[PDB]
Amino acid sequence: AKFIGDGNLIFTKLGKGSRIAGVFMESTTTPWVIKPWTDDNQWLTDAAAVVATLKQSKTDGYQPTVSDYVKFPGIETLLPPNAKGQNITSTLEIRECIGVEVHRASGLMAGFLFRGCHFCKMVDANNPSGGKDGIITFENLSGDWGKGNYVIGGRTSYGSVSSAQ
Amino acid sequence: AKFIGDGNLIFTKLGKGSRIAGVFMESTTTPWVIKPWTDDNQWLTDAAAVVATLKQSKTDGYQPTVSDYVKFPGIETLLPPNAKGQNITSTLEIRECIGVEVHRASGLMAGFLFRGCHFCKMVDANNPSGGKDGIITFENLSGDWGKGNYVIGGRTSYGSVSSAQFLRNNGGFERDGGVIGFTSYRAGESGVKTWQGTVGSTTSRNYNLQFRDSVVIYPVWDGFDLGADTDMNPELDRPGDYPITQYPLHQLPLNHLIDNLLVRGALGVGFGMDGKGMYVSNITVEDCAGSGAYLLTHESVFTNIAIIDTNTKDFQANQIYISGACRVNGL
Amino acid sequence: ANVVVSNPRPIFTESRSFKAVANGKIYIGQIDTDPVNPANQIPVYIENEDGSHVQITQPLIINAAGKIVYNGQLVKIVTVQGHSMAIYDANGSQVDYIANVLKYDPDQYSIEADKKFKYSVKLSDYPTLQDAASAAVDGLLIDRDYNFYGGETVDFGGKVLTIECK
Numbered sequence A: 001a002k003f004i005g006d007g008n009l010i011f012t013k014l015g016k017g018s019r020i021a022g023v024f025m026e027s028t029t030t031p032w033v034i035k036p037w038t039d040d041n042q043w044l045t046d047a048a049a050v051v052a053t054l055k056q057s058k059t060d061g062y063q064p065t066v067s068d069y070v071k072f073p074g075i076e077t078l079l080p081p082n083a084k085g086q087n088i089t090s091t092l093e094i095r096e097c098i099g100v101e102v103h104r105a106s107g108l109m110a111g112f113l114f115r116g117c118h119f120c121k122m123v124d125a126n127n128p129s130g131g132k133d134g135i136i137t138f139e140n141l142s143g144d145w146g147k148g149n150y151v152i153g154g155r156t157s158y159g160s161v162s163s164a165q
Numbered sequence B: 001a002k003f004i005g006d007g008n009l010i011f012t013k014l015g016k017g018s019r020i021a022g023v024f025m026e027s028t029t030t031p032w033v034i035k036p037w038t039d040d041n042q043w044l045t046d047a048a049a050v051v052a053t054l055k056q057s058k059t060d061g062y063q064p065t066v067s068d069y070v071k072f073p074g075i076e077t078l079l080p081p082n083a084k085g086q087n088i089t090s091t092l093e094i095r096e097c098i099g100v101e102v103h104r105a106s107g108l109m110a111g112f113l114f115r116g117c118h119f120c121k122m123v124d125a126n127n128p129s130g131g132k133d134g135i136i137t138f139e140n141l142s143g144d145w146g147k148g149n150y151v152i153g154g155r156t157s158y159g160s161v162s163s164a165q166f167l168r169n170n171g172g173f174e175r176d177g178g179v180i181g182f183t184s185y186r187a188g189e190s191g192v193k194t195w196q197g198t199v200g201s202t203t204s205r206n207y208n209l210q211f212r213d214s215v216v217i218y219p220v221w222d223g224f225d226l227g228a229d230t231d232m233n234p235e236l237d238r239p240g241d242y243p244i245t246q247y248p249l250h251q252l253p254l255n256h257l258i259d260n261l262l263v264r265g266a267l268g269v270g271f272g273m274d275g276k277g278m279y280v281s282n283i284t285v286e287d288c289a290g291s292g293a294y295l296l297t298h299e300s301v302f303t304n305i306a307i308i309d310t311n312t313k314d315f316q317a318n319q320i321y322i323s324g325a326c327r328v329n330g331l
Numbered sequence C: 001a002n003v004v005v006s007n008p009r010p011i012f013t014e015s016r017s018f019k020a021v022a023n024g025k026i027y028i029g030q031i032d033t034d035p036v037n038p039a040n041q042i043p044v045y046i047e048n049e050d051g052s053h054v055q056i057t058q059p060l061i062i063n064a065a066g067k068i069v070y071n072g073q074l075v076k077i078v079t080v081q082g083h084s085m086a087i088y089d090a091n092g093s094q095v096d097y098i099a100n101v102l103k104y105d106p107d108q109y110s111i112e113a114d115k116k117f118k119y120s121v122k123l124s125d126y127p128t129l130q131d132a133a134s135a136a137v138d139g140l141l142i143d144r145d146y147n148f149y150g151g152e153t154v155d156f157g158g159k160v161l162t163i164e165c166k
Helices: A047-052 A066-071 B047-052 B066-071 C129-134
Strands: A101-105 A108-110 A121-125 B007-011 B019-021 B090-095 B101-103 B110-115 B121-123 B136-139 B150-152 B164-167 B178-185 B192-194 B210-217 B261-264 B271-273 B279-288 B293-295 B301-310 B320-322 B327-329 C024-030 C044-047 C053-056 C060-062 C083-088 C094-101 C120-122 C139-142 C162-165
Touching: B164 B178, B178 B192, B192 B210, B271 B279, B293 B301, B301 B320, C129 C139
Parallel strands: A101 A121, B007 B090, B019 B101, B090 B110, B101 B121, B110 B136, B121 B150, B136 B164, B150 B178, B164 B192, B178 B210, B210 B261, B261 B279, B271 B293, B279 B301, B293 B320, B301 B327, C120 C139, C139 C162
Antiparallel strands: C024 C060, C024 C083, C044 C053, C083 C094
């Protein structure tokens, strides 16, 4: 069954051999997403055309990024303030743990993160649609520096930021 | 434990995130198989020699194909009636489900057919032996165009048809679907195949699939058949596709993502594709009895191509052939 | 647990008087349909706590205590599906009609517990991995440390096992 919500859901201090499988991440609020491309799979370099395709969807687009403001001039001003800069992403975290492997990540407007984690990975996929937060992200920004932290297999689509980091 | 039988064992109404693991599929009857290779794992190109290896087994060969009759002339007449027209495959069909991923697919005379499915994968298949029905078969002829149908990890062996076959799969702008990290052995058509033109009532043409880090060892024909506009519909309308007036024959904007592909052991041509606007890179075809590539493409770019020791039995007239006008940077 | 029947011992009484139904018949059949018809009417089984099911005639006999009786003894009657119960008195008049009778009660619990649960043996319930290996019929769980030496063989008996090491 789906994990519904927004923002992180932390699981602290798990020992080695933890498994999570078949997880789906759905956002309870449908955000505004932009699509700066066509159905010919070619970019829209006109900023007004990106705003014209502005819609509330949980797929087929990704939430506005500060990087798109630089790339397409005047896109920021045209977009409403409630339709840009938002983070509505159903996100998960494992905090200060060993041996936690996440298998078969799915969702729509989804993300996964880790903090303080060693020996921790993302394996397989159902092809999740990424949101504002990174699809696979590692921190040790509380904790101390990683090791054994890798990514193998699967793939992802969308995202407003890097899908592995 | 196994699932024994022939025909389709139909699984319906399986929700998101469902797993099928450890599956084995075995047919009740033992079908006839032919081995068109030596004991050094080359080829037998003599029809009588392939007939001499005729036996009832589910391994060390695959069932007589219609393509084998064309490939080896006069083989069909020599073969007995019972070894021809076979449909003996133990098939587990997942019909119209989403999130059903078949893990650790094995079997003898096995097939897995995903009908009308979307976002269903074949994840780490462990040495299956194919049959008349393909091991990895995405049939999206029934239902809407397939998207999210992938082969991620694993390998396949044998088969009397394509081991990885895509029927009516459009990945859209996402470029979903494809074959990554795969090894295919002895497909009776082509190891990894996007089907040529319109086959069936609706189109079987494939668009926007990603093929990287894939290996096809010993295909009968092409190892990677990435065409979709070969020998079908020379007439004015091409169903489920752009007209021949809009784009000439052997030209379509398929826009497959083509990098790091390896073909070895091909009896016929090792690589073939058609299309226009295609960008192809890192293709190495070596140690093939037939030609390295027959490229039916026009206005396509082929970069870092190595055709070494192909057409060593001289079925064809060249190591590489390009019918159209293409731009080849490096050879 | 939290599951309990309305009558701790099944007893049937007249609609507007508290007196047991004497020489009544009970027709057990498919839910939300009259069990009078033989087509709707279903065969009823005596559930033995041993783990056996035996088939008896479809109507149940009501004694003078208002309780179910078959073979001159109090029996525990079960069906293979959700059933409807229709209480009839000695004049054949319909005292009560219950369209839905469904219960989860697994008692016996020899046949039932195989089908409704999964089995995994925990290493903590055995002193050695060898004992937990032979006691693993499906799952195996390693929740604690195990010592071993050069040349120590553990046998699973040819059983197919999904092993989970934590």
